[PDB]
């Protein structure tokens, strides 16, 4: 009868594949196969990793259209416990526990999947240090971390993205100071490009959020807390700010470019969700916003285009209700709306790949995912034509 060999084989941690397959299969075993318009579908609230915790970022995996990454800042509940909380969530089968977990020594601000590799996850933290994590490996520490130098990011980073295809990829990140830096997924210890974005008289731009035209690399579009929207060419013939927009009086919080591609080219349409309930929409060719969103006040956070519908998007308000907005049918009232129970300080939303459902963040960590109406999810050529004619209204 062994007493130490089992004890030492338990102490020795060769359980990487063991724990990986156990986690991937036991949640499957939770299935009960015993032989004896808006509507909520799945509500996620991790008690251990989201108890009184504000979601810091949200993303959808293009390679795996079933995986989500959630970010958290430092926890005021307890500073001793790990502060930067990163969550990975899956819909393979219903389960309260998250599929994967991740920790960063600094408060995590933004995080996203990698287009170059279908497993690596990259995240921006409050210390301005991009964080690399490998999903396949069972580790809690960051896999890679950029050096904290003057050339690299030092101010908190709130938007990280990977541009290019799976063979010409480029990881682009923006710091709140205004530094734009490009990395590659292979090495995360040196900025391939680095340049402090400036509009005029050598003053930088306090970028809050960034967006890029769908299907296009370079010629980026950034949003500033100052209340102005800027078009910044990545390299082009001259790097820096390329356009001054009139913008919105309050700070620009959520900026996004149109993504639905069909019989017409609408990739130039820009929507910015400011701090004054005002989702301002326009095109890059016009210096003025084309239309304004006004039903209340006080901070609708972000605006996100529906990937499938050309004239439909979502925007979540700090008051605690998500309103679905379509341009083809309405221009003054939301086509659909719903409020999360308890009226929490709903933070952010993220359109899933191929649409048909929406993911909503919250300040309490209870993220909710649910679908939309079948009569409203599917677009048609009539939708594109009527959107084009409504854009010509003013």
């Amino acid at each position: 009868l062994t007493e130490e060999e089992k004890q030492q084989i338990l102490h020795s941690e060769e359980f990487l594949s063991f724990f990986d397959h156990s986690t991937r299969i036991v949640e499957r075993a939770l299935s009960e196969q015993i032989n004896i318009k808006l509507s909520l579908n799945r509500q996620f609230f991790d008690e251990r990793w989201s108890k009184h915790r504000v979601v810091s970022c949200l993303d959808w995996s293009s390679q795996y259209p079933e995986l989500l990454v959630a970010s958290y800042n430092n926890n005021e509940d307890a500073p001793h416990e790990p502060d930067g909380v990163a969550l990975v969530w899956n819909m393979k089968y219903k389960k309260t526990t998250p599929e994967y977990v991740f920790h960063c020594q600094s408060a995590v601000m933004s995080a996203t999947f990698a287009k170059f590799h279908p497993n690596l996850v990259v995240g921006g933290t409050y210390s301005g240090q991009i964080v690399l994590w490998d999903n396949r490996s069972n580790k809690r520490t960051p896999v890679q971390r950029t050096p904290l130098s003057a050339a690299a990011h030092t101010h908190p980073v709130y938007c990280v993205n990977v541009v290019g295809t799976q063979n010409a990829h480029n990881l682009i990140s923006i710091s709140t100071d205004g530094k734009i830096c490009s990395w590659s997924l292979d090495m995360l210890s040196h900025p391939q490009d680095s340049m402090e974005l400036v509009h005029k008289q050598s003053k930088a731009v306090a970028v809050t959020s960034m967006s890029f035209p769908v299907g296009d690399v370079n010629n980026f579009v950034v949003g500033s807390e100052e209340g102005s929207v800027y078009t910044a060419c990545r390299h082009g013939s001259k790097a820096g700010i390329s356009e001054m927009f009139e913008g919105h009086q309050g700070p620009i919080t959520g900026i996004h470019c149109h993504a639905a591609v069909g019989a017409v080219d609408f990739s130039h349409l820009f929507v910015t969700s400011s701090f004054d309930w005002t989702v301002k929409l326009w095109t890059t060719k016009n210096n003025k916003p084309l239309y304004s969103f006004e039903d209340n006040a006080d901070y609708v956070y972000d605006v996100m285009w529906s990937p499938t519908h050309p004239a439909l998007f979502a925007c979540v308000d700090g008051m605690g209700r998500l309103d679905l907005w379509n341009l083809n049918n309405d221009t003054e009232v939301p086509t659909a709306s719903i409020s999360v129970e308890g009226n929490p300080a709903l933070n952010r939303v993220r359109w899933t790949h191929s649409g048909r459902e929406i993911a909503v963040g919250d300040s309490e960590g209870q993220i909710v995912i649910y679908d939309v109406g079948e009569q409203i999810a599917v677009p048609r050529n009539d939708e594109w034509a009527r959107f084009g004619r409504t854009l010509a209204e003013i």
Partner: protein, 93 residues
């Protein structure tokens, strides 16, 4: 880790008892008592060795990476790869 793994595997359904068996049967760990754990886990190890022989009979390169039994009174789970033999006691439902 050990304790966190057992806790997360137990609290997912309020499982009556699970122990980690990284060795070929005869585990000294217990979750309700020594006998019902150890002898039943050894019997499971023998039967899954026989099942591995069964699945290798049709083609030797095949291996049993997943196994579950759901009868009228209990549910038994085991996911062996090379030595990681799991045990789960649960209601049939």
């Amino acid at each position: 880790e050990v304790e966190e793994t057992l806790k997360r595997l137990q609290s997912q359904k309020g499982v009556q008892g699970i122990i980690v068996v990284n060795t070929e049967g005869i585990p000294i760990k217990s979750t309700m008592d020594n006998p019902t754990t150890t002898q039943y886990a050894s019997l499971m190890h023998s039967f899954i060795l026989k099942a591995r022989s069964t699945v290798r009979d049709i083609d030797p390169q095949n291996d049993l990476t997943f196994l579950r039994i759901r009868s009228k009174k209990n549910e038994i789970m085991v996911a062996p790869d090379k030595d990681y033999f799991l045990i789960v006691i649960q209601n049939p439902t």
